[PDB]
Design a protein around this ligand. Structure first.
Ligand code: CA
Ligand code: CA
Ligand code: CA
Ligand code: CA
Lengths: 115, 106, 106, 115
């Protein structure tokens, strides 16, 4: 699994469950859809892509924080958290993008490994 | 100011100086405002009360150029940052492989 | 000031007002300075250039009392925060189950 | 496993490997040693304690960031990151403490589950 996403909720002290994650890749010209999914009961999203699909490029991972907070009855500030990075440029790597969410703040970090 | 940006470096423990910041507003992204961080890591003067209407905004901080100037290989292209406005300070704390961003209303 | 503390609330998007802050210095923890956050979430006036010598300091922010006043059940007792000093701003961003803290030197 | 700790490195984009973690419990009078260990190659520390040992109380988890950064040739600011919470007060829970480290900043969050 070359691209994994893990999301935690700083208001509830829990995994962020059933949060939508969309991945786009930058096109020749615009953001083209690449892969999407929803976080699990552990806050994790595995199975986005495959080694064969995951080419070099500039990717955007957008986590739908607005829907997540609204469904919980919380007022979100950010529409979404938008993590943008160059992948695979010096060869294939495995990436984990972790995100910690609050209504008016988020943080995100990357773990990169060389398989 | 209706909108202020502050950028801090978590590796060196210093303000992030001369970092480019662009703000965009969602149209029916229209560039909306931009500048470069001061010696204090702050950017004031972006907009006015008149122009800053309710809507969806994106603040994008060119973190990649900042790290490269320092000789450090960064992960991200930029710390974007996207919110609905319904006085705002947007703060960003930068590391090579992480960032956090927060909004404060005064 | 040699030492400033700022506290922000990540749930409400506001400065954290009237939060108690205690600073301690490691002895051969001696209370060193303390106060309460202003309407801006800031605490100035903690110490002087004379008293603030190199050493190991702990800044402890009473986050539990802040959340309880708001009617929110918090995880932490306090966001402590412990560093070696060799002008410092200590910033803390608070959520019920998380905090982050950063130091900036000017 | 009622108490787990996971640590990531924001400078390197990696797990924080072989970082010392000490847990103390507040005593009747002072911090009494409770449990300690080192993070794994995945940045995780399992096996700190057992359900039988983990009683209600005020715990301090101290992560030795100073040694970790010094061994990597980086200048640390914080001596250590000191996470302090009441545990088990309304009954036993499982706790994960996650920490993201940089030289001049750290964040930490809790995931609490009711087994
Ligand atoms: Ca290439
Ligand atoms: Ca309106
Ligand atoms: Ca000295
Ligand atoms: Ca009890």
């Amino acid at each position: 699994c070359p691209l994994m996403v893990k999301v935690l909720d700083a208001v509830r002290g829990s995994p962020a469950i059933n949060v939508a994650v969309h991945v786009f890749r930058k096109a020749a010209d615009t953001w083209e859809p690449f892969a999407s999914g929803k976080t699990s009961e552990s806050g994790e999203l595995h199975g986005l892509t495959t080694e064969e699909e995951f080419v070099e490029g500039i990717y955007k991972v957008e986590i739908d924080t607005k829907s997540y907070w609204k469904a919980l009855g919380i007022s979100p500030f950010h529409e979404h958290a938008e993590v943008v990075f160059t992948a695979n440029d010096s060869g294939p790597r495995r990436y984990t993008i972790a995100a910690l969410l609050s209504p008016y703040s988020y943080s995100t970090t990357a773990v990169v490994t060389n398989p």
